[PDB]
C-alpha cells in the first residue's frame, strides 16, 4: 500500500495488517464518472453566452 | 510546462503582406499602357 | 461629382460569414465537439445540435441573422444538417 | 461545492459529477474530483504536441474498457 504513518518508519505496511481496502462499488463507479467528467471538458472548444 | 503550440505562421504572413504592397505599387508601370512613376529626393 | 467608388459593405458580410462558420467548424460529424448555452438564469445547456444553438444566441450582425432564420425552416422540414448548411454559405 | 455556486462549465461538471458519486455512494467523493482533475493535467502534453481533443477522448474510451475488465 501507501504508508499513512506520521512517524518515520522503514518501508511500508501491508493491507492485511490494518484491513484497509476499497469496495468494488466505490472503485468501479468512480471510473465511469471520472471519464465522463473529463470528456465534457475536452469536448468544449468554446462557450456561448447571452446577456441576462 | 514551458510551451509548445504553434509555429504560428505569423512571420510568414507579414512577409507576404509586405510583398503585396510592393507589387501593388510597382504593377502600375507594367506595359506600354502603364503609368510613369516620379521620384523626388527633396533637393 | 461624388460618384460610385466603393461597395465595401460586402466586406462586412464576407467577414461575418467567416466568423460564424469558424464557430460551427469545430463540431461536425461523429468527431464533433460540445458547446454550452446559457440563458442568463444559470441554466447550462450542453448540446451539439445547431438547431438549439442558433436559437439561444442573439447576434447583432444582420448576416448571421438571415442564416439563423433560414436554418429554422430547414430544421422543421429536413431536420438534419443544420451545421452543414451554415458551413456551405460561409465557405 | 454545494455552498459555492459554479459558473464556468468545466468546474460545474465536476460539481454535478460529485453529486453522482455522493447520492449513489457514501464514499469516494474525493476519488472522483482528484482523478478527473489529473486526467486534464496529463492531457496538456497531448494538447501541446498538436493532438486534437477528439482522439484524446477515443483513447480514454479504449482505456476505460481495459481498466474495468482488470477490476
UniProtKB/Swiss-Prot annotation, chain A:
<comment type="similarity">
    <text>Belongs to the TCP-1 chaperonin family.</text>
</comment>
<protein>
    <recommendedName>
        <fullName>T-complex protein 1 subunit theta</fullName>
    </recommendedName>
</protein>
<comment type="function">
    <text>Molecular chaperone; assists the folding of proteins upon ATP hydrolysis. Known to play a role, in vitro, in the folding of actin and tubulin. In yeast may play a role in mitotic spindle formation.</text>
</comment>
<feature type="modified residue" description="Phosphoserine">
    <location>
        <position position="8"/>
    </location>
</feature>
<comment type="subunit">
    <text>Heterooligomeric complex of about 850 to 900 kDa that forms two stacked rings, 12 to 16 nm in diameter.</text>
</comment>
From Swiss-Prot, chain B:
<comment type="subunit">
    <text>Heterooligomeric complex of about 850 to 900 kDa that forms two stacked rings, 12 to 16 nm in diameter.</text>
</comment>
<comment type="function">
    <text>Molecular chaperone; assists the folding of proteins upon ATP hydrolysis. Known to play a role, in vitro, in the folding of actin and tubulin. In yeast may play a role in mitotic spindle formation.</text>
</comment>
<protein>
    <recommendedName>
        <fullName>T-complex protein 1 subunit zeta</fullName>
    </recommendedName>
</protein>
<comment type="similarity">
    <text>Belongs to the TCP-1 chaperonin family.</text>
</comment>
